[PDB]
Amino acid sequence: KPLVGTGMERAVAVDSGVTAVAKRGGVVQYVDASRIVIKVNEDEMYPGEAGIDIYNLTKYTRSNQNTCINQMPCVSLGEPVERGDVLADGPSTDLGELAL
Amino acid sequence: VTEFLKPRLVDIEQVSSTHAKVTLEPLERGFGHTLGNALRRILLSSMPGCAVTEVEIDGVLHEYSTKEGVQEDILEILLNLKGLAVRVQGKDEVILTLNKSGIGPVTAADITHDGDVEIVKPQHVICHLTDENASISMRIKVQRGRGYVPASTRIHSEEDERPIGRLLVDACYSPVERIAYNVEAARVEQRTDLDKLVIEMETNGTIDPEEAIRRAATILAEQLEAFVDL
Amino acid sequence: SVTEFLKPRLVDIEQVSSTHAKVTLEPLERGFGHTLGNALRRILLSSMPGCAVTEVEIDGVLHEYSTKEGVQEDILEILLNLKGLAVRVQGKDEVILTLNKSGIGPVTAADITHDGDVEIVKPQHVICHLTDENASISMRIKVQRGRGYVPASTRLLVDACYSPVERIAYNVEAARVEQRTDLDKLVIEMETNGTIDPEEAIRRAATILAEQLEAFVDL
Amino acid sequence: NGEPIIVPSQDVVLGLYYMTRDCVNAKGEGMVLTGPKEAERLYRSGLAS
Amino acid sequence: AAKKMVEREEAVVWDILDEVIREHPVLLNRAPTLHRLGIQAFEPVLIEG
Amino acid sequence: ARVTVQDAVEKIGNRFDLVLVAARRARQMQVGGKDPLVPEENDKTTVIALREIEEGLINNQILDVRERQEQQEQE
Amino acid sequence: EIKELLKLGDLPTSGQIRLYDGRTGEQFERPVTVGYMYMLKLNHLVDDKM
Amino acid sequence: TPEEKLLRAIFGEKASDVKDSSLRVPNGVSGTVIDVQVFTRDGVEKDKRA
């Protein structure tokens, strides 16, 4: 993280696509280096098709500039996520804050 | 008036496990800064440490891969292992083991014990297991050395490093972290000009204060002995 | 071995023939150039015992600003010339010399009265110039043992240049053992007042440095 | 133009400006020195600025 | 054999190279060589990096 | 090594005559057979020929008459 | 605001610290600015330029 | 050519009917091979490692 920022790092990192962010709030049922699983809060659940969200992070892969792309789960097992929240901080972002 | 007083290693305060202040009390005026900066220079540069150098994780081929059950992918597990502070009494190379299953952190208190190896911080966390039937099993390799040996230089001969599973960690055998001296006025019964040096050092635990400054003084002494007869 | 440091094997010392040496010692460990060179520099400069003219009382002068009848080198130039005086005393500790001499030429250091305790390393050294007349000069110089350097502002008075050395300056250079490229080539370089050549002043400094360390050197 | 293009540029002219200057009252003001060598030894010893 | 040795960077190649380099100047040249002092010859010093 | 060739310039005048006269002598030594007239300090042929030009014992007339002498004794 | 946040920690209000030479152990005259600055590593890496 | 001819007729090492054009790592690069992907033309025998 920048020790001195301007508050815009979070907007820039979430608006970008490198971060993996929640579609619906819930409880993180299983974390892993490869994937995050989100037992959806029952309120944000459709009538049928019970489901629980699952985000398969992108591990190491070459950017257009050959630099590395990969995502780390910044949430731990059984951690309450909310909608529009960051579960995987991609490259150059720390807890969903742009960090070059 | 043509011979100096020689400093003695007076009371060694042990503030914390890692951070301790030593005091060399009877210094002539002028030798305080000289001795202190030479000792700080040596302590920061040249001290024998016990860094971990190789890791053989079980079903893993390289450091750029994931492992089911544990969230820290392998690069981060190596970065967490390099910070493992380990004091081995007997040997110059010891292979540790770390087998552990079940959810939770895999701290340094999960490494299996040898009679000579001692883990200084058993609360240092290596990785996290997040799966009921998932287990990590690594063969760590601690060894002694000086300064800093990046893997690049370390992979020079390599001893024909056959297996691909062997992930190499970058070695940091140097227990001290930051040495700060202060040269104040000792309360010697007379001789107003009598400085005392106070060497506040902060190791990672694997080396203790008195033996440390004694080692630094030995190094300075041998180099000065090469300098005393040209 | 986790304790096996390079020791310099190229101690080759060049010198300008009497009192200006230059020792290109190599190869130190990485970073040992500045530690060793700076320890020796501080020791030589600040605490290196030796004798030096500590004060002077002129037989005809009270203030530090005055003129004597026949000398053009004023009293401050006389005190400067006395500061460069390179005395080496024997077992006596606080020696006093008399400098009464009359004539017209320069007043060299050889115009000092002898003794078995003090030896002047440059009798050819000038002390003062004299008029072309009956003008005489006389004064009690006080040479006194000492360690480092003590200015008159701390203490007639004359700044005590106790230590022998006049210039030390080390330039840690690049060295190279076979494959390694980062090492230290310590180039010491010294001159002295004359009472001892530089290649021995260095070893006396290293002696004083290592014996302060004897309370921790574990053999 | 004959002017030497070995002009010291920016850290050197400031090192030399900080060196060859004077202060109205600093440590060891107004003490007669017997040559540049003694001035250097005074400065390195910490007895004169 | 010489090519193979240089290709594996034998221990002796650095002494052979320090002897090749010694009095052998090299021309250093920046991109827009506006005046002739933009191509200058230096004696090399085998540096690590 | 040799930092400056200022002394070698005065012995020969031209700065290009100096280069052409020193390359000639240094190629005499290099390929070959001839020996340096000065105690070689682990130098290359270029700085050796320059240092010999510095001492006035190498130049165009001297090298040419040395040519003529060996052209004679080659017979 | 910067000075107040400095004073809330135990740093000097002037933003400047006295610093000692690492080699000679002596103190730099004229205290120096020392602070934490965010530094980026552009990919004009020398491993590609050379 | 000639004497290369004699040097192969002496030591008898045959002249291989194949030229080496294998893909090797660039000069200076030093990194683990983290992946290998093999594509084949349709209807061409995949090797043991494809």
Swiss-Prot record, chain B:
Keyword presence, DNA damage: no
Mutagenesis or variant effect for residue 161 to K: 5-fold decrease in CRP-class II promoter-dependent transcription
Disulfide bonds: none
Record family assignment: Belongs to the RNA polymerase alpha chain family.
Entry domain remark: The N-terminal domain is essential for RNAP assembly and basal transcription, whereas the C-terminal domain is involved in interaction with transcriptional regulators (such as CRP) and with upstream promoter elements.
Reaction catalysis annotation: RNA(n) + a ribonucleoside 5'-triphosphate = RNA(n+1) + diphosphate
CC annotations in GO: cytoplasm; cytosol; cytosolic DNA-directed RNA polymerase complex; membrane; transcription elongation factor complex
GO molecular function: DNA binding; DNA-directed RNA polymerase activity; protein dimerization activity
Keywords annotated in UniProt: Acetylation, ADP-ribosylation, DNA-directed RNA polymerase, Nucleotidyltransferase, Transcription, Transferase
Record GO biological process: bacterial-type flagellum assembly; bacterial-type flagellum-dependent cell motility; cell motility; cellular response to cell envelope stress; DNA-templated transcription initiation; intracellular iron ion homeostasis; nitrate assimilation; regulation of DNA-templated transcription elongation
E.C. numbers: 2.7.7.6
Region (Alpha N-terminal domain (alpha-NTD)): 1-230
Keyword Nucleotidyltransferase: yes
Result of changing residue 41 to C: In rpoA112; temperature-sensitive, blocks RNA polymerase assembly
Protein name as catalogued: DNA-directed RNA polymerase subunit alpha
Highest taxon of the lineage: Bacteria
Region (Required for interaction with Crp at class II promoters), start-end ranges: 158-161
From Swiss-Prot, chain E:
Signal peptide extent: none
Biotechnology: Co-administration of salinamide and rifampicin or salinamide and myxopyronin suppresses the emergence of resistance to both antibiotics.
Coiled-coil ranges from the UniProt annotation: none
Post-translational modification: Acetylated on several lysine residues in the presence of glucose.
Similarity-based family: Belongs to the RNA polymerase beta' chain family.
Quaternary structure (record): The RNAP catalytic core consists of 2 alpha, 1 beta, 1 beta' and 1 omega subunit. When a sigma factor is associated with the core the holoenzyme is formed, which can initiate transcription. The rRNA transcription and antitermination complex (rrnTAC) consists of RNAP, NusA, NusB, NusE (rpsJ), NusG, SubB, ribosomal protein S4, DNA and precursor rRNA; S4 is more flexible than other subunits.
Function of the protein: DNA-dependent RNA polymerase (RNAP) catalyzes the transcription of DNA into RNA using the four ribonucleoside triphosphates as substrates. Resistance to the antibiotics salinamide A, salinamide B, rifampicin, streptolydigin, CBR703, myxopyronin, and lipiarmycin can result from mutations in this protein.
Listed name of the protein: DNA-directed RNA polymerase subunit beta'
Gene responsible for this protein: rpoC
From Swiss-Prot, chain F:
GO cellular component: DNA-directed RNA polymerase complex
Catalytic activity: RNA(n) + a ribonucleoside 5'-triphosphate = RNA(n+1) + diphosphate
Protein name, as recorded: DNA-directed RNA polymerase subunit omega
Subunit description: The RNAP catalytic core consists of 2 alpha, 1 beta, 1 beta' and 1 omega subunit. When a sigma factor is associated with the core the holoenzyme is formed, which can initiate transcription.
Enzyme Commission no: 2.7.7.6
Enzyme class: transferase
Keyword tags: DNA-directed RNA polymerase, Nucleotidyltransferase, Transcription, Transferase
Superkingdom of this protein's organism: Bacteria
Entry similarity comment: Belongs to the RNA polymerase subunit omega family.
Annotated source species: Escherichia coli O157:H7
Alphabetical GO biological process terms: DNA-templated transcription
Its biological purpose: Promotes RNA polymerase assembly. Latches the N- and C-terminal regions of the beta' subunit thereby facilitating its interaction with the beta and alpha subunits.
Molecular function, one GO term: DNA-directed RNA polymerase activity
From Swiss-Prot, chain G:
Residues recorded as bearing N6-acetyllysine in the entry: 7
Top-level taxonomic group: Bacteria
Complexes and interactors: The RNAP catalytic core consists of 2 alpha, 1 beta, 1 beta' and 1 omega subunit. When a sigma factor is associated with the core the holoenzyme is formed, which can initiate transcription.
Family: Belongs to the RNA polymerase beta chain family.
Function: DNA-dependent RNA polymerase catalyzes the transcription of DNA into RNA using the four ribonucleoside triphosphates as substrates.
Name of this chain's protein: DNA-directed RNA polymerase subunit beta
Organism whose genome encodes this protein: Escherichia coli O157:H7
Taxonomic lineage of the native organism: Bacteria, Pseudomonadati, Pseudomonadota, Gammaproteobacteria, Enterobacterales
Range of the intact protein held here: 1194 to 1243 of 1342
